[PDB]
Design a binder for this molecule. Structure first.
Ligand code: SB9
Ligand code: NI
Length: 194
C-alpha cells in the first residue's frame, strides 16, 4: 500500500516514490477524502509538503537527488486521493504554502494565462514546449487537516501552480493544454506571464 509505506515515520519521499507517464494512475480521477481524516491522510499531506521543502533546499535536494518543485499531488505518488501540496517561495519566505484536501475551483476568470517559460512535471521525464493555457485567476475552496474550509483567490504564478496540481487529481497532464497546431500561439484573451 503506497500510502501505508509513504506515511511510515521513517519514510522520506524522494523521486523513487513519484510515478511517471504511462502509469494509469496519472490519468485516473482521484477520490475525495472524507472527514474526519485518518492519521495517514494527515501524515501524507505533511510528507508531501516536506518533500517540496526538501526539493527547494540546495544541500538537501542534492543529498536526496530531488528535482526542484513547487507542487505535488497524491496521484503522483500512486495514491488516488484528492490531496495536493503547494509551496511557492518569495522571490516571509514562502508566497504560498498549503496542503489542500478536496481542492476545487469554484470561480475563474474569462481571461486565460500561461507561463512564458512553459511548464514541466515531476512525472514527465522529458521536455514539452508550448504555452500551457490555464485560467488567469481562480477562486479555490479546500479543506485543511482539521476539516476547516478555506476559500482563496489566486492570480499569476500561484494560480498556474494550483491549477496544475488540481489537474493531477482529475487525471489531466500539463501538455493536454498545449495547442497542438501551434504550441506558442497567442490567442485573444491569453496573458503570457514572464
Ligand atoms: C513552475 C510550475 C508551474 C506549474 C507546476 C509546477 C510544479 C511542477 C512539479 N509537478 O510535476 C507537480 O505536479 N511548476
Ligand atoms: Ni505535475
Amino acid at each position: 500500500s503506497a500510502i501505508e509505506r509513504i506515511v511510515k515515520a521513517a519514510h522520506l519521499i524522494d523521486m523513487c516514490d513519484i510515478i511517471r507517464e504511462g502509469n494509469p494512475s496519472l490519468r485516473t480521477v482521484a477520490e475525495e477524502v472524507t472527514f474526519p481524516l485518518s492519521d495517514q491522510e494527515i501524515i501524507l499531506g505533511e510528507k508531501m509538503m516536506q518533500f517540496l521543502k526538501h526539493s527547494q533546499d540546495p544541500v538537501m535536494a542534492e543529498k536526496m537527488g530531488l528535482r526542484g518543485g513547487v507542487g505535488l499531488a497524491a496521484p503522483q505518488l500512486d495514491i488516488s486521493k484528492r490531496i495536493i501540496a503547494v509551496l511557492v517561495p518569495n522571490i516571509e519566505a514562502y508566497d504560498l504554502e498549503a496542503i489542500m484536501y478536496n481542492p476545487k475551483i469554484v470561480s475563474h476568470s474569462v481571461q486565460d494565462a500561461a507561463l512564458g517559460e512553459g511548464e514541466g512535471c515531476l512525472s514527465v521525464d522529458r521536455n514539452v514546449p508550448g504555452y500551457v493555457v490555464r485560467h488567469a485567476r481562480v477562486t479555490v475552496d479546500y479543506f485543511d487537516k482539521d476539516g476547516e474550509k478555506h476559500r482563496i483567490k489566486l492570480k499569476g504564478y500561484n494560480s498556474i501552480v494550483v491549477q496544475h496540481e488540481i489537474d493531477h487529481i482529475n487525471g489531466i497532464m500539463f501538455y493536454d493544454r498545449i495547442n497542438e497546431k501551434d504550441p506558442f500561439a497567442v490567442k485573444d484573451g491569453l496573458l503570457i506571464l514572464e
